[PDB]
Design a protein around this ligand. Structure first.
Ligand SMILES: *[C@@H]1O[C@H](CO)[C@@H](O[C@@H]2O[C@H](CO)[C@@H](O)[C@H](O)[C@H]2NC(C)=O)[C@H](O)[C@H]1NC(C)=O
Ligand SMILES: *[C@@H]1O[C@H](CO)[C@@H](O[C@@H]2O[C@H](CO)[C@@H](O)[C@H](O)[C@H]2NC(C)=O)[C@H](O)[C@H]1NC(C)=O
Ligand SMILES: *[C@@H]1O[C@H](CO)[C@@H](O[C@@H]2O[C@H](CO)[C@@H](O)[C@H](O)[C@H]2NC(C)=O)[C@H](O)[C@H]1NC(C)=O
Ligand SMILES: *[C@@H]1O[C@H](CO)[C@@H](O[C@@H]2O[C@H](CO)[C@@H](O)[C@H](O)[C@H]2NC(C)=O)[C@H](O)[C@H]1NC(C)=O
Ligand SMILES: *[C@@H]1O[C@H](CO)[C@@H](O[C@@H]2O[C@H](CO)[C@@H](O)[C@H](O)[C@H]2NC(C)=O)[C@H](O)[C@H]1NC(C)=O
Ligand SMILES: *[C@@H]1O[C@H](CO)[C@@H](O)[C@H](O)[C@H]1NC(C)=O
Lengths: 106, 170, 50
């Protein structure tokens, strides 16, 4: 409706008997392949991303936002737990880091 | 072919030019309408040869290789169910090319979700895409993943009911 | 010739692979929409008869 791509903002310009809209949009570029999974199996529990998606660069699993590649460590702060690992088709095994663990470790 | 009639008709001026111009404008407007509706992608996307979409069946909407027209069963049913100086101009886009445009749109929305509409087509598994759509309407991803077989069965049943309803309603 | 609808593109679909963008382009596009016409008035009596 407001240009090709993900619309950010627009500018109106007057024209003789008309209007010209300059649509400023965000276009994704330089995409890269990653190996993905619906959920992460850890401690007999299924972990799902709160807002992102699980990706793998070949050896390590990360969670990233869907529209830009920004890999982050899969923790309990960016994932939520629902059910065990027996129901979700395609769940993979990976560790889930806990930020609270070094606090009581020290 | 009457010369006297044309000589008398010339007394009325450029009425004929106005009518021809209006009809020409309508005729080009129809082609513009078809371009606006169907030609929204500049890439002709194709489905993978293996139709492994996590239980989701799209055979009733994807083009049939057995048919020479390369139409879907639903599109084939739709085409079957629709039946002195005058000329009929052919449309600029033929039916097979319009079907090809719809096939490209279907392949893009199945293999890439909404990414192809906003830029380059980014591949994503179809259950994950469905989970994204579930999150769009405010339902968590887990609900989709846990009940994936049920959701796929419901979708296939609904698509079959659509074909039956179109074939059974005049 | 018979027209080509678009450049051919086969998306590499598989059940466990995703494509994630690593960059972006800020794209500005133009959309021209007519708003008004020339306001014309015709004196019917003067036009037909003067
Ligand atoms: C996937 O990304 C991870 C994280 O960047 C890579 O792990 C790093 O690899 C470098 C290269 O040897 C090491 O120096 C770092 O210490 C590693 N980081 C961690 C946290 O282990 C991993 O190698 C990448 N995999 C591929 C196939 O590129
Ligand atoms: C992921 O981890 C789970 C749990 O450790 C694995 O499930 C085990 O699989 C072995 C061999 O198939 C069985 O003997 C165990 O009883 C299973 N445990 C449970 C709790 O189900 C699973 O196979 C692992 N998957 C991968 C790909 O490594
Ligand atoms: C997807 O749905 C189609 C249509 O319902 C299935 O095709 C049917 O397959 C059965 C068994 O092979 C046949 O007896 C039917 O006659 C087929 N129907 C039609 C319309 O051809 C198809 O098997 C389903 N699954 C896949 C993976 O394509
Ligand atoms: C992601 O991987 C797929 C498959 O390896 C790549 O698709 C191939 O691209 C090459 C180059 O255009 C083609 O010759 C192959 O035929 C493609 N294979 C398939 C199955 O489509 C794809 O290009 C990769 N994407 C990125 C960004 O590297
Ligand atoms: C993302 O794309 C931008 C282009 O918009 C890249 O910026 C270019 O980087 C090259 C190499 O450093 C420069 O020669 C160009 O002049 C840059 N262009 C502009 C407009 O600044 C940017 O480096 C890319 N980033 C990544 C991570 O790929
Ligand atoms: C993808 O399909 C392969 C078979 O080709 C299967 O082994 C694998 O488990 C599937 N992965 C997912 C996530 O469905």
């Amino acid at each position: 409706f407001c240009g090709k791509g993900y619309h950010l903002m627009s500018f109106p310009q007057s024209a003789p008997h008309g209007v010209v809209f300059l649509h400023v949009t965000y276009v994704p570029a330089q995409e890269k392949n990653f190996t993905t999974a619906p959920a992460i199996c850890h401690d007999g529990k299924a972990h799902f991303p709160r807002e992102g998606v699980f990706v793998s660069n070949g050896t390590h699993w990360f969670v990233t936002q869907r529209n830009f590649y920004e890999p982050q460590i899969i923790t309990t702060d960016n994932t939520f737990v629902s059910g065990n690992c027996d129901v979700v088709i395609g769940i993979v095994n990976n560790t889930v880091y806990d930020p609270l663990q070094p606090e009581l470790d020290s | 072919d009457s010369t006297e009639c044309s000589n008398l008709l010339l007394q009325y001026g450029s009425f004929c030019t106005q009518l021809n111009r209006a009809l020409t404008g309508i005729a080009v407007e129809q082609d513009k309408n078809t371009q606006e509706v169907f030609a929204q992608v500049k890439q002709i996307y194709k489905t993978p040869p293996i139709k492994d979409f996590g239980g989701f069946n799209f055979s009733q909407i994807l083009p049939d290789p057995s048919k020479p027209s390369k139409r879907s069963p639903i599109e084939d049913l739709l085409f079957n169910k629709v039946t002195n100086g005058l000329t009929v101009l052919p449309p600029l886009l033929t039916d097979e090319m319009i079907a090809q445009y719809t096939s490209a749109l279907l392949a893009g929305t199945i293999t890439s979700g909404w990414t192809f509409g906003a830029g380059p087509a980014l591949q994503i598994p179809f259950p994950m895409q469905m989970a994204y759509r579930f999150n769009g309407i405010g339902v968590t991803q887990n609900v989709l993943y846990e009940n994936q077989k049920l959701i796929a069965n419901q979708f296939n049943s609904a698509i079959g009911k659509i074909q039956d309803s179109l074939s059974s309603t005049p | 010739y018979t027209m080509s609808l678009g450049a051919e593109n086969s998306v590499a679909y598989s059940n466990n692979s995703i494509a994630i963008p690593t960059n972006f382009t800020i794209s500005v596009t133009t959309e021209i929409l007519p708003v008004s016409m020339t306001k014309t008035s015709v004196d019917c009596t003067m036009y037909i008869c003067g």
